[PDB]
Scaffold this active site. Structure first.
Site, PDB file in Angstrom:
ATOM      1  N   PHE A  44       0.769  -1.220   0.054  1.00  0.00           N
ATOM      2  CA  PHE A  44       0.074  -0.052   0.008  1.00  0.00           C
ATOM      3  C   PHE A  44       0.906   1.292   0.005  1.00  0.00           C
ATOM      4  CE2 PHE A  44      -4.421   0.719   0.097  1.00  0.00           C
ATOM      5  CZ  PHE A  44      -5.029  -0.394   0.292  1.00  0.00           C
ATOM      6  N   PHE A  45       1.931   1.276   0.458  1.00  0.00           N
ATOM      7  CA  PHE A  45       2.912   2.312   0.777  1.00  0.00           C
ATOM      8  C   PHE A  45       3.399   2.723  -0.567  1.00  0.00           C
ATOM      9  CE2 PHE A  45       5.921   5.416   2.801  1.00  0.00           C
ATOM     10  CZ  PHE A  45       7.019   5.178   1.928  1.00  0.00           C
TER      11      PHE A  45
END
Ligand SMILES: [Cl-]
Ligand SMILES: [Cl-]
Ligand SMILES: [Cl-]
Ligand SMILES: [Hg+2]
Ligand SMILES: [Hg+2]
Ligand SMILES: [Hg+2]
Ligand SMILES: [Hg+2]
Ligand code: NA
EC number: 4.2.3.37
Length: 305
Positions: free
Chosen positions: A79-80
């Site tokens: 996600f990052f």
């Protein structure tokens, strides 16, 4: 923590919890990021250095089997990376590149196996993360995860176009804003964390559903609250209204939490099946509760970066 952002109720009534497997997540995730070449070695090292989304997850999915937590941790790191690609495409006005990525993610989500080695490492990493998450519960759960995540991708797409036209959604090293888009996904992930796909009748029981909604909504409202005072770098009463909504999520959750646990009691009819469903509801609800404290303290700690 700033008085304007402080939540005495969370501090007093939602004691932080930490998953026992937490110490072992860091090295494994670092290895995975490097293996999938999701970021250059140096970017991996920065992300792995201090606080990261794994810390949020480790204060949230309590009781998760070690392998499930590892899969969720790696997914949170992905996600990052996605957020970074999202920002980059936006800043550089790469509408075509974003559209194509958007399409590949939808495709890989439904068919991760044949995308494990896609030329775009972001897609390859995504496919691997999803493949691993698909290995815990029956295909019916996988299909729901996918259904929900298709919606998340489209939310990012909406944001791409909004931000491309000068609309500023909310910079922040470890923001939670876009993560809240995945509210149904976080809810879905409670299930492999307690080792059971809940029947529709149970997870759509009003007490379970409401508890789940309020847990996630808290983070949305709280992210609003934390964003307001940053306006400096009317206000007081604007904060006042958001604050009341944040407090209302908490007190409403406490009430429905009681209802959810009563429902759990009812499920425990003495049979092994009843005991399993009952135990899973209790664990999931407990983690809906842990989300409050994990989010609250994660935001505070992230302010050191
Ligand atoms: Cl890491
Ligand atoms: Cl937040
Ligand atoms: Cl509200
Ligand atoms: Hg990390
Ligand atoms: Hg089950
Ligand atoms: Hg916040
Ligand atoms: Hg609320
Ligand atoms: Na939700």
């Amino acid at each position: 923590v700033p008085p304007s952002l402080r939540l005495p109720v969370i501090e007093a009534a939602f004691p932080r919890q930490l998953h026992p497997y937490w110490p072992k997540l860091q090295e494994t995730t670092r290895t995975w990021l490097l293996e999938k070449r999701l970021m250059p070695a140096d970017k991996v090292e920065e992300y792995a250095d201090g606080l990261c989304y794994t810390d949020l997850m480790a204060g949230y999915y309590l009781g998760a089997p070690d392998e499930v937590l590892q899969a969720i941790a790696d997914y949170s790191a992905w996600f990052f990376v996605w957020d970074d690609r999202h920002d980059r495409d936006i800043v550089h006005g790469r509408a075509g590149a974003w559209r194509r990525l958007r399409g590949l993610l939808h495709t890989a989500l439904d068919s991760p196996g044949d995308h494990l080695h896609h030329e775009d490492t972001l897609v390859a990493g995504f496919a691997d993360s999803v493949r691993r998450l698909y290995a815990f519960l029956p295909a019916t759960w996988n299909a729901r995860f996918a259904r929900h995540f298709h919606t998340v991708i489209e939310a990012y797409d909406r944001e791409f176009h909004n931000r491309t036209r000068g609309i500023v959604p909310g910079e922040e090293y470890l923001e939670l804003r876009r993560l809240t888009f995945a509210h149904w996904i976080w809810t879905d992930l409670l299930e492999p964390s307690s080792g059971c796909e809940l029947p529709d009748a149970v997870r759509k029981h009003p007490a379970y559903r409401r508890a789940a909604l309020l847990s996630q909504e808290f983070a949305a409202w709280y992210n609003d609250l934390c964003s307001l005072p940053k306006e400096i770098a009317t206000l007081e009463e604007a904060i006042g209204e958001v604050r009341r909504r944040v407090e209302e999520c908490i007190t409403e959750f406490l009430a429905v939490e009681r209802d959810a646990l009563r429902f759990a009691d009812e499920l425990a009819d003495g049979t092994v099946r009843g005991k399993e469903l009952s135990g899973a509801v209790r664990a999931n609800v407990g983690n809906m509760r842990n989300w409050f404290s994990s989010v609250y303290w994660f935001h505070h700690e992230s302010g050191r970066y």
